[PDB]
Paper text:
The periplasmic binding protein (PBP) CeuE1 is an important component of the Fe(III) uptake system in Campylobacter jejuni, a commensal Gram-negative bacterium in the avian gut, but a common source of food poisoning in humans. CeuE, an integral part of the CeuBCDE ABC transporter of C. jejuni, is responsible for capturing Fe(III)-siderophore complexes in the periplasm for delivery to their respective inner membrane transporter. C. jejuni does not itself synthesize siderophores, but capitalizes on their secretion by other bacteria, such as E. coli. Here we report a combined solution and structural study of a series of synthetic tetradentate analogues of the enterobactin-derived bis(2, 3-dihydroxybenzoyl-L-Ser), to explore the ligand-binding promiscuity of CeuE, both wild type and with mutations of the Fe(III) binding residues H227 and Y288.
Fe(III) complexes of 5-LICAM4−, 6-LICAM4− and 8-LICAM4− were co-crystallized with CeuE and their crystal structures determined. The structural differences can be quantified by calculating the mean planes defined by the six carbon atoms of the two catecholate rings, and measuring their inter-planar angle which is 97°, 111°, 110° and 110° in CFe-4-Lic, CFe-5-Lic, CFe-6-Lic and CFe-8-Lic, respectively. In contrast, the longer and more flexible linkers in Fe-5-Lic, Fe-6-Lic and Fe-8-Lic can adapt to both the geometric requirements of the Fe(III) center and the binding pocket of CeuE. The Kd values of Fe-4-Lic and Fe-6-Lic are similar and lie within three standard deviations of one another. This indicates that the entropic cost incurred upon binding of the ligand with the more flexible 6-atom linker is compensated by its ability to accommodate the preferred octahedral coordination geometry of Fe(III). In addition, the affinities of CeuE for Fe-4-Lic, Fe-5-Lic, Fe-6-Lic and Fe-8-Lic were determined using fluorescence quenching, which yielded dissociation constants of 21 ± 6 nM, < 10 nM, 33 ± 8 nM and 58 ± 8 nM, respectively. The crystal structures of all three complexes show that the siderophore analogues are bound in the Λ-configuration, as previously reported for CFe-4-Lic20, (CeuE)2-[(Fe(MECAM))2]6− 19, FeuA-[Fe(MECAM)]3−, FeuA-[Fe(enterobactin)]3− and FeuA-[Fe(bacillibactin)]32728.
Residue numbers in the entry: 22 to 255, 257 to 310
């Protein structure tokens, strides 16, 4: 279990511990650079857009184009450190993609880690949202939003077929890899109750290498596809999965090859009030 975010009220600020370290963070930071696209969407959901002074515009999702106003701090894998310095932020918010540059970032300004725990998605998700909301006095609003998300989870959990199995896959160039429970997309199995065609897929950040022979041998009832091409600006998932083998699966037969929106699933990783809700609905609409 990843250490949670913990905070102590210091009057004009909070003293804040997370899994990478500790920071004094002002109440109401007014100049926040945000490198997690999920948190950006939480900032939008809580009407905190004017607090955001820089975003990774090379990877700004279509669903967050209201932020194309903001100065750019590069990409999520290509941080523009000079632009971050030059903006003189009072807070920087990162997740897993920037952990290795923690120290550089913290030299510049207080740097908060809001990564998701793959083994405890929901508790880490609520902890991230609330920790952010608490900086602004908005815990009440945030908890209401979270409670709405949980009604969706409970509903979605109910319309679930106990006898059908899913495979989660990610496509990239002409390469497929597999994800299962406890992975960066595990909410599908771990939270929404959809069974896994294969319980022993080793968790890895960009998945474990497979091919279409594997997909047909497993013969899942659903295939959830996350097309990383779209994120990288590349060809498409429909290409590599247009083959005779995939076409024979139960998932093809029953029109359950579901292309998940990668901006939400890959980039945001469901780490926001908006993305997570949309993602619950997407799965719910794709499986009923
Ligand atoms: O540490 C990470 N990546 C290091 C960069 C090595 C990846 C090579 C190419 N990646 C990309 O160009 C890329 C671009 C945008 C978003 C991404 O995730 C990407 O991997 C990382 C961490 C959590 C989740 C990810 O997914 C990551 O990668
Ligand atoms: Fe990546």
């Amino acid at each position: 279990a990843m250490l949670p975010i913990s905070m102590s009220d210091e009057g004009d600020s909070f003293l804040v511990k997370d899994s990478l370290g500790e920071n004094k963070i002002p109440k109401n930071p007014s100049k926040v650079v945000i490198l997690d696209l999920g948190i950006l969407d939480t900032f939008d959901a809580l009407k905190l857009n004017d607090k955001v002074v820089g975003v990774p515009a090379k990877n700004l999702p279509k669903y967050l184009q209201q932020f194309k106003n903001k100065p750019s701090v590069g990409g999520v894998q290509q941080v523009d450190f000079e632009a971050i310095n030059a903006l003189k932020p009072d807070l920087i918010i990162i997740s897993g993609r920037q952990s290795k540059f923690y120290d550089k970032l913290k030299e510049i300004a207080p740097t908060l880690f809001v990564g998701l725990d793959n083994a405890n998605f929901l508790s880490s998700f609520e902890n991230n949202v609330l920790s952010v909301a608490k900086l602004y006095g908005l815990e009440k609003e945030a908890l209401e939003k979270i409670s709405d998300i949980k009604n969706e989870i409970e509903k979605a959990k109910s319309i679930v077929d106990e006898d059908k199995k899913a495979l989660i896959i990610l496509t990239n160039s002409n390469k497929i890899s597999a994800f299962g429970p406890q992975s960066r997309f595990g909410i599908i199995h771990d939270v929404l109750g959809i069974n896994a065609v294969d319980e022993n897929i080793k968790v890895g950040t960009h998945g474990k290498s497979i091919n279409s022979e594997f997909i047909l041998e497993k013969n899942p009832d659903y295939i959830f596809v996350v097309d990383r091409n779209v994120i990288l600006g590349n060809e498409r998932a429909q290409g590599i999965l247009d083959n005779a083998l995939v076409a024979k699966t139960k998932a093809a037969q029953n029109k359950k090859i579901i292309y998940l929106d990668p901006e939400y699933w890959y980039l945001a990783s469901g780490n926001g009030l908006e993305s997570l809700k949309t993602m619950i609905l997407e799965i719910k609409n794709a499986v009923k």
